[PDB]
Amino acid sequence: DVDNKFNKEQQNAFWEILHLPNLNEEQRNGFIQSLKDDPSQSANLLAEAKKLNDAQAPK
């Protein structure tokens, strides 16, 4: 399910997903599902989100 307790650093990652202006809301969900599989690896996930933004290249 969902862990009532969270790490403050983890919260930072959640906001970055929201920031991605280039990406629509559905893409953001994809990161969340990954987070559930490996909460310890959320840091690893943090690096991946920035990379995806480049690919959309709305400009």
Swiss-Prot record:
Important immunodiagnostic reagent because of its ability to bind the Fab and Fc fragments of a wide range of mammalian immunoglobulins. Immunoglobulin-binding region B repeats lie at residues 3-59. It is found in: Secreted, Cell wall. Belongs to the immunoglobulin-binding protein SpA family. Plays a role in the inhibition of the host innate and adaptive immune responses. Possesses five immunoglobulin-binding domains that capture both the fragment crystallizable region (Fc region) and the Fab region (part of Ig that identifies antigen) of immunoglobulins. In turn, Staphylococcus aureus is protected from phagocytic killing via inhibition of Ig Fc region. In addition, the host elicited B-cell response is prevented due to a decrease of antibody-secreting cell proliferation that enter the bone marrow, thereby decreasing long-term antibody production. Interacts with host TNFRSF1A; this interaction leads to the stimulation of both surface expression and shedding of TNFRSF1A. Each of the immunoglobulin-binding region repeats can bind the Fc region of an immunoglobulin. This is Immunoglobulin G-binding protein A. The lineage of its organism: Bacteria, Bacillati, Bacillota, Bacilli, Bacillales.
